[PDB]
Structures are given as C-alpha cells and as structure tokens.
C-alpha cells in the first residue's frame, strides 16, 4: 500500500497543472497515468542528490467515472461551491491535477513538459501556476505560512486513507483554490491590524494568546475540533506566485486530507462563518478564482492500469 | 571614474525582465524612481548577503530619453530597427523603460520588481514581463549550452562599456531585447546531428564544430563578426529560458549588451537578411521574435544625480 | 504510541543550554509555557525549513516535578547524586528546568530561547546559559573527535527511551548535564601520545587504541560498561565545546541521555570514585565539573496535555 | 536484524576494493571483520553530517568456508562464467569485497587505508577502483545510469534476505563486474543509434516507447518478469572510473539482490541472449574484465565473533 | 602600493571582538605578536579554504601607539572623545589593542583568538570579548536589516582607506567601537510604525521612508551627513548582534571604519548632542553604549616590518 | 597588456596532472590543440557555472619548445636539472607538455582531459597521469596542512609572473613538477613531536614552530630563502595528495610556479644538496621523487596567436 508523495515537505519550486480531459481522450490519459511515476524518475534521477522532484497526480469526480469501472473513493465528489453573504468559493472545471515539486524550477518544468507532451490533443489546460518560495517561508501577505502543518505520525493519520475505505488505502483528497490578493488594501493596514487578521505575529510567527486572538482571525476559524475533542488537521502545500505587471499577487492553495469533509468544514467556517464570526477576515483581501477537488490514488493504483 | 551598472555581472539562476511604456504625464514619477532604483536594489538585496547576487540594470529607450532629459543624447540611441527579411522578420515593439533584474533566487527578483512597480503605478503601462530560470547545465529551450563564448574580464569591458568615443556617457551600455518563441515540435523532428549543424556546436559536450564541418548558415558562423580592423566584434548575452507548458510556450529571452548598437545590429542583419554565403540563420527556422526594443543603460552615477 | 521529544536527533553545529530554577509561586506560569513549548519551536523553526534543524528538549528536575505535578513520578527521577571521590568531586548544582536547544545556526537557538524566557520572566531564575559551537571536525577543546561511539538507529532507541519498565512515562528519557572547564595549559604539556593514553583513541585519526595498549584508567576504558547480559550499556551524548578566550575558559558542556539514570551514574561513579584497576578517570586530571543536574525529559504528548 | 548500508543511495565518490585471503590469513581477516563497523564510525564521524561515509563488506563462496564453520547462505556460490557465442563474462578471484562510498573521496581513502593497514600481509589486492560522479548521474557512454533502481519498500523486498533463509536475514548478494568501454566505436554511432542500444533517450533519459524499443536493447534484456508476473529488480550502484592517458573509460558494475538468481538471469540474457535477441548490444562496446559474487552479511553478523 | 588589512571585506556569519590593554612592561611581547598576526591568520585560515573566510583586523589605540612606536603618528589618532549630551552619554573606556576577527564559522574565530591570546598571556589584560552572530536576514536585535547603506567598491575604498592626506600611513584606517545594550522591553512596547519612525526605514522590507515622512530625529536622518562639497560622508559598518538570554542582554556591537575619525565623530555628535532640528537620535532611547574606543588599523606591511 | 594563464588561481578539491611527450611528426597536431585549449576549457567549464572553477594551465618543455617554435626562447627555459646529492637524488624524467587541470569536481577535470587527449591521440605518448584530491583540512599524505605560506595578491603576482626581465614573454611563468611517493611506514614510526621537527610546524594546528626550536634541517627552514637584496624568494605551490591503497602508494604531486626557475632550483638545491648547517631536508628521508620536469607556461595570448 504505497502512497504518492503526498506527505513530502514544501519545496522552493512548484508547478501546478490542472487540465480537463477532452471527449475521446480517455485512452491517452490512462496510458500516461500508468507512466507518470516512470517519467518522474526519468527526469528526477538526473538531479538525484538534492533535486527532490516529485509529482502527485489527482483525478476529479466526473473524470473518475469516465476513466474507471468499479468502486469509487467514498469521499470523491465535485467541489462544493459556497455562496456566502459576502464571499464566494467558486467551483471551476478540472479533471486531472499535477502537483509537481522540486528544489529547482527546471526539474518541475522538464517533467511538466514530458507529461503535457504525452497528453497533447487529449486534454485542455485549465490552469498553470509556477510557485516559488518567498523569503523565510512567507506568503504574499508577508506571513510565515505552513507553520502548523502536522508532521510524522500525525501527518499520516490526517492525510492517508485507511481502513475506512480499504480499496483506496494509501490515497488522499486534494482541494485546490487559486487566490489573488488585494495588496493595496492589505498594505493599508498596520502590522498590528494584519496580525489580528491572521492570528499570529508577523515577524516572529508566534501565535497570538487566546485572550487577544479575534474570533474572525484566520487561525481561529481554521482551528476545528472533532467529536472526539481531537484537532482536525490538513496538510497544506501553498506556494506564492504572481506577475508584477498584471498586479497578480497570489496564494496557490492546496490541502491534503484523508477525507474532504475536514477541508470542507474549514472552507464553510471561512466563507459562511460561525455564530461568533461573519467570515474569515483574510477573505477581505483574498479572492478565490478556482476551486477543484481531486482524489490522489496510491502509487500502486496508477501503475496497475 | 564613472561607475557602470551591473552590466558586466554574470548569468544567474533567476531573472525578471520588465518592459514598460511611460504614460502621459508620468515623466516626474519616473524620474523620482530612477534616482531611487539603486537604493531599492540595496534595500532588498542586503537581506540575502552574500549569496543573493541581486542586481537591477535600468535601460531607457530613444523616445523616452527625450521626454525625460534635456541636454545631450547617447550617440547611438535610436528606436529598434525593424528587419523585414525575405523569410523572417525582427519586429519592433514599444518599450520606454527596461528593468533587467537578476538574482540567485526568484523571490529577490520578485520583491524588487514589486517595489519598482509600486512606485510607478499609474505612471507606466506594462508591455512585457518574463520570469527566466536556469535550465539544467546552462541550457536553453533548444537543449544547447547557451552563453559559452561570452567575453570575460578586460575583453568584456572593452566590448560592453561606452568609453572615450562618447565621453559624456562613459560607463553606459546599449541593450537590445527580443523575446523569441521556439517551435519545439519541428526542432525535435531533427536528429541531434542536424541540430548541431544548425547551432554550430556539439549538443551534449558544447564543443565547437571544426571549421571544415561548420555550415555557413549555422548560428555560430553568422554571429561571428570581424570588424574592419580584423578584431572580433563581441557582445555580452544574458539570455534566459522561460515558458508555459499549457500554452506550448518555450522561449528564449534574448538580451545583449554592447558599447555601440551597431555591433548587435550587424549580427541581427546577418541573421535575418543573410550574407552572400547564407540565406539566413537556420536557428530562425525554429525561432520567432515577438518583441524587439533598444535601450541605453546609463552609468549608475547618472541615475543618482537626478 | 507515545511520541518522544527530539532526544534521538543528531549533533548540530550550534546549541544553547539553558538551566533555570522555578521561583516561589512560578508554578502556573511554568505549566503554561510547558504546554506551548512545541508550538514555540514550530513558530521559530518553520522559518528556516529545511536546513534549520531547530529542536528543543525540555527537562524537569526531581524537586521541580513534585511542585508541578500530582500523581505518579518517573521511576528513576531523583536529584543529581554528588560524588566525593579521593581526588575529584562531581558537584550537584540547582536546576529545575532544562532547555536543550539545537540548530544548524545560532540565531534559531537564540530566537527560541528569547521566546521561552520572555514567557518565563519573573517566574524563573537563570542558573546557567551556555552557547555551544562545533569545533572543526567534531572535536572538543582537548582536540579529540568527540561523539564517535554514540549509538544509532534501533540501538539508540533501546538505550535512550523509557519503555515498558515504566509504562506511564514511555517515550521519556533522563538527561544528566555537567559543565566542565579544562586546564589547557596542563593538557598541552602532555605529548600527543600521552594524551592518547588519557582518552583511549588516536588523536588525529580517531581510531580506538588496541586492547593491549589501552590503559585501564583511560576515559574510553572507564566509560565502557557491560550489563548483566554481557551487552554494552550505552548513553547518547550531545556534548558541545564552549568558551571565552579572555577569561581562559575552555569548556565541554556534557549532556547524556539514557533510559535510566543508573547507566549514566555507573559511568560517573567509575570516573570519579574509580575501580580496583584505576584510581579515577585520567580525563578528570584536566577537567573540572562546575555544574551537575539530572532531568527527566517527558514524551511530547505529556507536555501538550497540560 | 540490522543490515549493512546496502539500501543507501549513490554517492559522488566510491572506492571498490577486492582482495584474496592469503594462506594462513584467516585469523587476521576475522579480527578486521569484527572491527569494520568501528573503523567506519572512527573515520565517518569526523565529517558529520554531510560526509555520508559507508562501507559494505562482502565475503565470497570459497572464502566463507575458510572463515566460518556453521551454516552457509543458501545462494552463495562462485561467480558463474558465461561463455556466449560472441561475448564472455569472465570469473576472476576475489574473497573479500569492500564497497566504500562517501560524498568525498578523502573519506573513502582514509577508511580504505585503515582497513588495508590491518590486513597487510594477510590479503593480496586483486582490484582497486576509484569511482566518481559524472555530470548528471551519467556513465562513460553518456547516458543517465541508475534511473530504474527500486526505492523504499520495493528496494527492501528486492535486496534483503528474508524468511526464505532466516539465519542470514538482513544480508544481500553483490555481483561485481569491471567493464571497459570502446569509446572510439561508441562515438562512431549517431545519438539515435546509441539510444537504440540502450533503450532510452540520451539527453532526457526518457524510456523509448514499447513499439520502438529494440528487443536487443539493454533495457529490454534486463527487464525480467518472474513467474508471478511481477518485475524482478536489483539495486545498482555503478560508478564511472577511468584514466585518460591509457584510454580507460570504465563502468564499475555492482548490483545487490536478495538472491543471485535474479542477477544471473539478467547476465544470462545479456551474454547468451534470448529467442528474440543474439545478445545485449551494450556488450558490443563493453568488455567485462572482472566478475565476482559476494554475500554481504547483516551488520550484527560481523560484530558477533 | 601599500597593502591594507581586510578592512574592506564584507560581513560574515560569525565574529569575535577582542579588546585588551597592554600591561606595564608588555610592550615587547605585543610587538612580537603584531609581527606574527598575519602569519597566525594564515596558519588557522588555510585549514578552511575556500569557504572559511577567516580574517583578523588589528587596531592600535592612541596611548598605546606612543608606548609601542617611536616616529610619526597617524594624523587622526587620538583617544575616543567622550560625549556628555543632556540625556545620553557616549562613554570612553580603556582599550589599547583591537582584534576584529571574522569568519563564516565561529570555530575559526575562536581558534585564532586562542592563538593570539596564548602569545599575549601575561602582557595584556582583557577589557572586552564579544561573540557576534548573524541574526536571520542580516537583522539586528531591534529587528531591522542592518548594514544596507554601506558603501561598496570604489566608494568604499575612498571612504575607508587613508590616502595621500597622510602618506606615511596610506592603506590604514580608523575604527570606532561601541558596545550597545538594548532595552527590548521598551522597544517592543512601540508599534511597528513607531519603530519605523525611530529608524527611518520600513521594518520588514528595509525600504527607506520617503523624505517627507522621515522624522528629523530618526537614526537614518541623523547619520546622513553631507560635507562642504555636498558629497555624502560615509563609513563602513561591520556591526554584529550578540547577547545572553538569561541576563536579558540584547546587544549591537558597533564597529565603523573610516579614512578619518572626523566622519565617525560627526555622526556620534549628531546622535548624542543633537542638531537644531532634533534633540538626539531616537535610537539612543532604547540603546546604551557601555564601551567606546578608537583605534588606528595600520596597513598590513606596517605590522610585518616590526 | 599580456593576459596570463590561470597560474595565480587558488587550490581546488580536484586536479588532473597530465604529462606527455610529443611523438615524431606530432608537432602540427600539437600546435592546433594549443590554439584551441582555452576554447575547450570554456566549452566544458561553462556547463558548471558558477561553482565549477575549471581551469587548465598548459606548459611546454625546453626540448619541445625548439621543436614547436622558431625565434626567441624564454630566458630561463631549460631541461630539469638532475640533482645527485650525497643521499637523495632529484631525477629528471621526460615530458614535453604539461596540462595542469583543476576544478571543484573531478568530472569537469576528466571531461576536459578527455577532449584534450582526444585531439592529441596519435601525436603524443602519455608519461604521467595523476588524479589529485583534497585530503581533509588541506592536508597532505604526511598529515600536515600543506600550502599555508603561499603568497597572495600582489606578492603572488611579483613572485610568479615574468615581467620586464624578459619582456617578450611577460605574463608567462615556470612550472616545476615532481611526483613524490612517501614511506608511510617509516613516517608513522616517528612521534608527532619528531614529525613536527621534520616539517617545522605544529601538526594539528599548523602553527609555525618558534625560531629557537625550529631545526636547521626542517623543511620550512630549508625552503625559506632570502635573495641578495634581503627580500624573501617565494613560489606558488599547488600540490595535491594522490594514491592507491592496494599498491601502498601515498603521494604528493608537487607543482610550483615562479617567475624564474632559479628560485625553485635554489630551494631544490638546499633540499637535496644541503647547506653548511644541514646535510639535507629531513622530509626527503620519507619522500622519493619519481618524476622531475620543468615547463614554461606562456601567456594566454601567446597560445591563441598560433
Ligand atoms: C487565502 C489564502 C490563504 C492564506 C494567505 C493563508 C495563510 C495562512 C497563514 C499565514 C497561516 C498561519 C501559519 C500556518 O500555520 O500556516 C495559516 C494557517 C492555516 N490555514 Fe491558511 N491561508 C489561506 C487559505 C486557507 C484555506 C482556504 C484553508 C482551508 C481550507 C486554510 C487552512 C489553514 C489552516 C488549517 C491553518 C492552521 C491553523 C492552526 O491550526 O493553527 N488556509 N494560513
Ligand atoms: C570532561 C569532559 C569530557 C570529554 C572531553 C570527553 C571526551 C570524550 C572523547 C574524546 C571520547 C571518545 C570518542 C567518543 O566516542 O565520543 C569519549 C567517549 C565517551 N565518553 Fe566522554 N568526555 C567527557 C566526559 C564524559 C562523561 C562525564 C561521561 C559519562 C557520564 C562520558 C561518557 C563517555 C562515553 C560513554 C564514551 C564512549 C566510550 C566507548 O564506548 O568507547 N564522557 N569522551
Ligand atoms: C556494461 C556496463 C553497463 C552500462 C553502461 C549500463 C547502463 C545502463 C543504462 C544507461 C540503463 C538505463 C538507465 C537505468 O535504468 O539505470 C541501464 C539499466 C539497467 N541495467 Fe544496465 N548497464 C550496464 C551493465 C549492466 C549489467 C551487467 C546489468 C545486470 C546484469 C545491468 C542491469 C540493468 C538493469 C536491471 C537496468 C534497469 C532496466 C529496467 O528495468 O528498466 N546493467 N543500464
Ligand atoms: C616531498 C613532498 C613535500 C611535502 C609533503 C611538502 C610539505 C610541506 C608542508 C607541510 C609545508 C608547510 C606548510 C606550507 O607552508 O605549505 C611546506 C612548506 C613549503 N614547501 Fe614543501 N613539501 C614538499 C616538497 C617541496 C618541494 C620539492 C619544494 C620546493 C622546491 C617545497 C617548497 C616549500 C615551500 C617554499 C614552503 C613554504 C616555506 C615557508 O616560507 O614557510 N616543498 N611543504
């Protein structure tokens, strides 16, 4: 039961590729899916010391039914649009996700080239984002981003499908959203105001004390306890991206979890709000422009095709 | 002695190329920025001492110069000359300001670009923005090592920096930019040996082909130029690969520095118009220029005294 | 499955050792910090992904334990036992809390230490603070490679982590700290060969001396201890050099982890009291212990549930 | 049971040392074998943590019987010479193998010095090769080399002796062959011809499609499926080596497997051929000059004597 | 022609600052060391070619100079001038010799310092010893990027090195040291925006405040000094953070090089005494100078010929 | 004006030394290569920008010079002078061309060597090939830090480069190579203190022995040479360890550059023949020279104009 590299850490470079499968493209796609790990090694081995090239392949709900007969992952469905009073989490088309990471962009680009070379005329590109590390693990808002990710055993338990769906053990669910930020508005706030939005100190990344942390802060809304009283956790691999000329300053959100229910709860709290908070204050400076849900199978699953 | 911009600095792993036009009434805002550009570079750059290697080279176009400054002009400064060859065309596109930003990390480039554009917002219109990245062992999108024959040391200084021939602008340089897109499908149809004949060097090892084997229409042959004096005419190239996989964009962002544009223009002419021995540069059969601009990059002192 | 603290992590290039006593009425403030310590570690540590390697191991002393917690105690937890040998003395000094902070850079250690002490200000009194640094090829102030025979992998786990023998505290460990100052003048008076006889290994190459040549009063001989089964009893050492040139302070900060303090104490006894074959450890002729404390380092879960 | 570093990855530097045990040298050898791990740490600790020094010790069939009284590894025998119609895989003497790797040659050299210092007058050197990384993981033929090595769980299953021989669990079998290449002849081929010999693209290391890959290509012949239909796999740690003046351009082949049967099958296919292929085309440019088989015991085994 | 000490070399990750006074009758021992200092630097430094970057700059005080040498004095050499402002005081403290030791690793600094002090034992009394460390992205203890506006290249040479104005000491420089301790409690009481007003630059991005927003009593404003000619007067700063968490010591070790002490002293005067527009430098409201010494750092040749 | 080869560049982690004789009728092929050598260096070297540090220094022997060129000869160029001392002998062995190839990685050296020999195949016979590697902290096979006292900067230029004393060959240098094998058995028989007396420096710390303790027959004493003017005579050494464990080969590949061979020869004479105070260099008691050749390394321009 060998998972894809869904537990691997953040890297300095990433390419996110989202495509839809054109009518009659199913066969070409199936062939690629079985060769994806082989292509990864072909490119990756060239940089074997410190390259850290990996590709995580995700398949959407509608795409799954077109590609495979038999059982479906229990949690796999189209991304649920959230129409909140103020902010909207839109659902956009996407059949296949390629989450490509390395310590260098060239490796990502080479692999992406090989994948798309095989898929040409079978797929239509929906989104392509080239992500880059920004200083000391910062996002476009200038905050350290990824701090509270689970590690080790906790990561395994939060991310990997287990006995609750045994046919797809070793798989995971990925939710992607591309966000664009209003930097003008954001930079109008004082640092202290920004800290109140996020829920952590800007420079030092220290969490605000519970008596000072607003209920509508990002950290407060995305902290979720389950029925057991245990924290519900996701693994985030967000990357900054952008284009200065077009005033694009972005966060590419990607979160892995063993069930989409966890990610969706966090989304709901952010967009719809709670009793104590109208919505996540971060959304006042952030617009989601894409939204897709994918199941990322175990590596074995892709190979045996 | 006049202090040049970082026009002599080597190739880096990351680059941002930014080309803008100055909007109506934007002159004043632009002048203010120009005087702060070196200051902004240090502000961002110092954070990543000593491996950051952040630099920004600022270029000003012909038309823009007259809008910005009174007094003398650089002797060689004019708009990019469009070349309509029998087969291939080197197009001229608008551009008033060039920002050539390099570092060993993209974040540094992006941060500086953000600061520059933040100051210029509402005074300029973006024309082009390219994020360049090192591709393996200094390769381009055609899979060839690219930059090998760049001059170094004293030779670089002599080829790139304006000297006594135009003493008011000593320490300056001329930059020609062209964004090229490549037809990878067609290129990958050729055998490696055929590709080598196009370039003029061995693909894997980057060793120059013997003179008896090197075609007259090879890229290396056409861009090798001797002056009347019999000396080699040389430019300093800082090309970077760039691209977008989804849109099938595989590019070379060409930038070349020289002490006079005449040198770069000769090479362009040989490539696009051809010689007696060669119809045109074979590389153009797989490469399309989509932008073309010429800028003068002043000495650092010049920008500061503003 | 209990999650241990980073007691199995390897040696780093930088370390801060912080030992404090809890002031009267400081218990509450201390408990709050203890529950946030892992959170503070991540807050600072994440900034320097992935080469930072920041970790903090928190230890609690015997007397402090009773002030902080009701319920069961770790089976082996007691105050450091003073050893008054014929010649050398291992002193016991006050210490309630241990912070063993390691990273590949001192800044990370310093930042974390700042955050911890910021929260504890007015609740604790500092007893000791040492900033450790890697010295050449893993050498100590005596000029010998130091840490060679540390257990690794499964052997490390078995030697260091509390298991079924005390199931309520599984995943914990015991840390013994001693700050040593060295008489470099006297030490440098010895020939290299004499120094090798003191340690029990070759100086330059770090190769262990043959059994027929290794003195019974050598450091290696005295600290080699076999258990009832005839297997070696082992500890995990994270010693760091430290010092101040002006004050002629050349130090080894000793810290050793073990699943039971009995192992470390046996080695101490052999060193300070001697055996039938050896009066004492010859290393002590050039080394003075100035502190001595024992701490229990709980599993990470234990700290969090507070 | 603790294996030797048989699963560890490729490094930038390696020393391969093959010796025979002289008459009456048994005792000296046994002493060293029990100290080998100790010597490794003595040298290795000096270059923590980027040194990555390791030594894998192998013992030959004939040597085993001279050294030890009890049971033998089930698969341990002398290297089987293969006399093909055209190419020959020679068997050469070798009692002990020292496979020494680090990120720096000095570390390898220091350890080798210590080992040989202890063995002087008890062993005769047969072969010594100093290997070095060549660009982006290339061999002397200019191809990326090691791409299809198994990793993680697959590596463990392919390499480590398990329950099928429980007394030697955690051990492995190493086959070494020193190859010299005819670079003149090789460089006479076009790149496309070279690709047909190997079975992969030269520059990009992408495997040739199944409809284009020759049956006598290196990749085709070394593929090998077992009765179960699963792939048979070995772990390769080949290093380039050579001397420019003497026109020596070499590949030092070393492959680990849980049973020698796997490696021997690949050898047989290469040298003797199949129904579809006379022999491996790579052998047309490669001459084996040594050939030895060693069993590499678990670390515990070496320590306990 | 004259070979300077490493006074133009950049900031490193690690530093040791050592200040000693020469005891009565210690002159001879000191002279011997001074002639061997470069030799000791190479002895230690060569071991860590090429990334070690070990250097030692040796400075000699005014009073010490007269005790050590007969003949001419550097034109600008005098004791540090104490400044008694209305509110803040720049104290002058004893110091005859300065050793400014830098490397990319502390071990190298410590080894060299050990060798130097080994030779000087019983001839000198230690006054101060500080172990400096890089803090994140070139930050100081106040959390601001520190060193941004240092001159580079030719400008650095012109600002730092003694030239024709004192030809017997060409290639020398003047170093002013001050150890500052910071009141972090008070400082962290300010909002970021208030802190920016104190310094004169943005905290996170290190971008200089616009001239219309920058307070006259900001650090940047007061230390910006124009000469009669209208040119900027510049110094080269190699400040390092240092500190001890337990004792609440958060420090900046200030060291500035200049071709004449007049430049540094002007900046000091503006900071401590104030101008017409500003009572004093606001940074001093959170910073206390605890040492103050002035040294002349001779050309390397000068030390060798001794 | 004349541009030297990379004779001033520092020591690297990897080196290949290649010595060949020119076969009868090979002159033409050799001349062609000589003119392409810099081109080949760039072809390979550019692939590993910027940390590759690939360089090739080409040397031509006395006899070879006369076969290759007409006209004036370098003033100092002659065959290596055999030294038959009472005890030790410095042998002269054949060698027409020297290729001193250095980089931070062996692959780069090997690739370049491959290209050079590929062009020379059937025109030259290999005499010697050594692959050198860095050994710990810049140590040699004797376990001593090696290269410490090399001149740097201006001093290096003055010691190494031919100047006005032979103006036709300004920018050239003279290289003396000797391959030494060491008797490690005998050497390891000495105590460390005895070894230090042989070399003239401390083993571990690389600190030079005081003048009152340093033997007259120590390596450091014999190779310290003053000229008639009282100035120190200096050479630039790029020695590399090499060896083969199986064959008990532990070597130092000696290469020294100087502006005149007279300097190197004086040091050789002192070592092999001795002085009034010393029979010979004690290092030779554990070191055997197995090759000896002298080459002139022309300015880069000289090779190009061919
Ligand atoms: C709009 C773009 C977003 C930005 C700029 C952003 C930024 C941040 C930052 C700065 C933190 C605190 C440091 C950390 O632990 O990573 C954080 C925490 C977190 N974010 Fe986001 N975030 C974004 C969107 C989202 C979304 C859409 C989700 C969930 C679907 C999410 C889930 C989380 C979670 C779970 C945490 C950790 C909370 C905790 O347990 O302390 N984020 N984010
Ligand atoms: C006074 C300061 C000390 C110094 C400078 C020192 C130095 C060394 C050195 C150089 C070694 C050999 C290399 C190695 O395996 O690490 C060593 C080994 C060792 N030291 Fe220490 N040590 C000191 C104090 C202690 C103390 C107090 C203990 C016990 C509580 C201790 C326990 C050990 C052990 C167990 C070994 C490994 C012995 C073996 O199995 O070979 N050391 N020490
Ligand atoms: C004569 C020298 C040899 C050279 C230059 C060589 C080179 C290569 C190359 C370039 C590849 C493709 C990249 C890779 O997967 O590593 C490869 C694959 C392989 N080689 Fe070799 N090889 C040699 C000898 C051998 C020998 C003697 C064996 C074993 C008997 C062997 C077993 C393999 C295997 C198992 C593969 C992987 C094939 C797959 O499953 O896709 N090779 N070799
Ligand atoms: C037998 C092989 C040799 C070895 C192992 C060796 C080793 C050393 C060592 C360890 C040093 C002291 C550190 C240093 O400054 O580099 C040294 C210094 C030196 N060696 Fe050698 N050396 C050898 C042969 C030679 C030869 C043949 C010459 C020149 C004829 C030479 C010239 C020098 C010089 C000039 C110095 C510096 C002396 C000073 O001013 O302090 N060496 N060598």
Author numbering:
A (entry chain E), D (entry chain F): 8 to 312
B (entry chain B), C (entry chain A), E (entry chain C), F (entry chain D): 7 to 312
What does the paper say about this structure?
A widely applicable approach is the use of photocaged substrates, where the photocage is soaked into the crystal in advance and then activated using a laser pulse to provide uniform initiation of the reaction throughout the crystal. In this work, we describe a thorough characterization of the application of the NO photocage N,N′-bis-(carb­oxy­methyl)-N,N′-di­nitroso-1,4-phenyl­enedi­amine (henceforth referred to as NO cage) to room-temperature microcrystals of two proteins: a gas binding cytochrome c′ (McCP-β) and a dye-decolourizing peroxidase B (DtpB). Laser parameters for photoactivation are systematically explored, and time-resolved structures over timescales ranging from 100 µs to 1.4 s using synchrotron and XFEL beamlines are described. We have demonstrated a sample and time efficient approach using fixed targets to carry out time-resolved SSX and SFX experiments with an NO photocage over the microsecond to second time regimes.
On binding to the heme, NO was observed to bind in an end-on fashion via the nitro­gen atom with an Fe—N distance of approximately 2.0–2.5 Å and an Fe—N—O angle of approximately 105–150°. The variability in these values occurs across the six independent heme groups within the crystallographic model and could represent either genuine differences in binding due to subtle differences in the crystalline environments or simply uncertainty in modelling a small ligand into the electron density features. A small shift in the side-chain position of Asn245 was observed compared with the ‘empty’ site structure in all six of the hemes, and at all laser powers and timepoints. An intriguing observation was that of differing occupancies for the released NO within the different (chemically identical) monomers of the homo-oligomeric proteins, particularly for the hexameric DtpB (in contrast, McCP-β is a homodimer). One possible explanation would be differences in the proximity to the bulk solvent channels in which the photocage molecules presumably are present, although no correlation was seen between chains with higher NO occupancy between the differing laser powers. Assessment of occupancies in light-activated processes remains challenging, particularly for small ligands such as the diatomic NO. For our experiments with DtpB, we found both B-factor and Fo − Fc peak height quantification to give results that display the same occupancy trend with laser power, but both generally overestimate NO occupancy compared with multicopy refinement [Fig. 6(f) and Table S4].
